[PDB]
Write a protein that binds this ligand. Structure first.
Ligand SMILES: CC(=O)N[C@@H]1[C@@H](O)[C@H](O[C@@H]2O[C@H](CO)[C@H](O)[C@H](O[C@H]3O[C@H](CO)[C@H](O)[C@H](O)[C@H]3NC(C)=O)[C@H]2O[C@@H]2O[C@@H](C)[C@@H](O)[C@@H](O)[C@@H]2O)[C@@H](CO)O[C@H]1O
Ligand SMILES: CC(=O)N[C@@H]1[C@@H](O)[C@H](O[C@@H]2O[C@H](CO)[C@H](O)[C@H](O[C@H]3O[C@H](CO)[C@H](O)[C@H](O)[C@H]3NC(C)=O)[C@H]2O[C@@H]2O[C@@H](C)[C@@H](O)[C@@H](O)[C@@H]2O)[C@@H](CO)O[C@H]1O
Lengths: 154, 159
């Protein structure tokens, strides 16, 4: 009858993916920790489902000066973008490191950069997150990002 | 309105320092202490991480005792004797594959605190004192098992 939660720790290199040992579902959390901020080509952090849908794609675009949030079915076009302007402003007082937290709230992903909520993203695709990935060409983050998941919360 | 709003707060806690939480930790919430070092050798003095209530009760005291080779979990009311210890033997074994850093996570599950070192649950601690956590502290008696600054991250507004 007691709640047993879990912590899993992943080291994700730029241009790499990890399968989750414990999937992320409603009530759960993933935080991506970067040991650098540069602050560089477009850089993305992704939550994917088992079938390869992008449940949440977070694209940091320094030159265009926007963070793009979107979803995509496998082998299908991108869905409707949500944008937040001014990338640097989302990392105020960040120093030489950063964290990006995604709360799975069932109907929404709440994305928090350090302590600042940057979007309450209305989901365009539902389901459990079974993998994470980190894409860059010149990343805004450290070459290895540490992802920590907190699961079995609900 | 109807949507869930959770919060992330980040604290830098020096050895021998405390922080008051901007958002209290309650049932359903999480705190993780991140150390950028792990010293298991001038050998470290007993080192503790603490969750305290507003009146200064130790809701959860986690004492890493390298020389005695045990981790002690306990609680204490303000100005009162320590309550019943729970112990886990062999400190180094709890940090296997840790490398040069470590994390200590506490889940507040209402009736219990679940403590996880890296990925390993080390105790399901039945609470001896209940209530919200309003501050955290880091005590090294001397030399610490962790980095001089430990970063605490709280995840709140989960329930
Ligand atoms: C104003 C407007 O609507 N602009 C649209 C662009 O934003 C679109 O660009 C794509 O946006 C996607 C999210 O909606 C996504 O970020 C995508 O890049 C990512 O996915 C592609 C494959 O589709 C590649 O894997 C990229 O490497 C990957 N990026 C990262 C950082 O992981 C964007 O497309 C790329 O970037 C744009 C700027 C162009 O250079 C494209 O040629 C790239 O493929 C665009 C397409 O959906 O639609 C515009 O209307
Ligand atoms: C086998 C057994 O039951 N042993 C008992 C000891 O473990 C008790 O020691 C105290 O244990 C506490 C948790 O139960 C706690 O760790 C405490 O140290 C902490 O609190 C004291 C104030 O009470 C000081 O502030 C310490 O600095 C602080 N330590 C840390 C790291 O935060 C323990 O007491 C200290 O350590 C022991 C080993 C002796 O040196 C004491 O004189 C110290 O005060 C003990 C007392 O509750 O009961 C034993 O039976």
């Amino acid at each position: 009858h007691m709640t047993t939660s879990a912590v899993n720790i992943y080291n994700i290199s730029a241009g790499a993916s990890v399968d989750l040992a414990a999937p992320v579902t409603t009530g759960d959390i993933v935080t991506f920790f970067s040991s650098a901020l540069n602050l560089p080509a477009n850089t993305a952090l992704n939550l994917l489902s088992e079938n390869g849908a992008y449940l949440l794609h977070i694209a940091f675009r320094l030159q265009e000066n926007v963070i793009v949030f979107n979803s995509r079915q496998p082998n299908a076009p991108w869905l409707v973008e949500q944008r937040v302007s001014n990338v640097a402003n989302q990392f105020i007082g960040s120093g030489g490191k950063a964290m990006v937290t995604v709360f799975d709230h069932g109907d929404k992903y709440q994305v928090v950069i350090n302590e600042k909520t940057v979007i309450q993203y209305t989901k365009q695709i539902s389901g459990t997150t079974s993998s994470l990935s980190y894409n860059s060409t010149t990343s805004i983050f450290s070459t290895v990002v540490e992802a920590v998941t907190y699961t079995g919360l609900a």
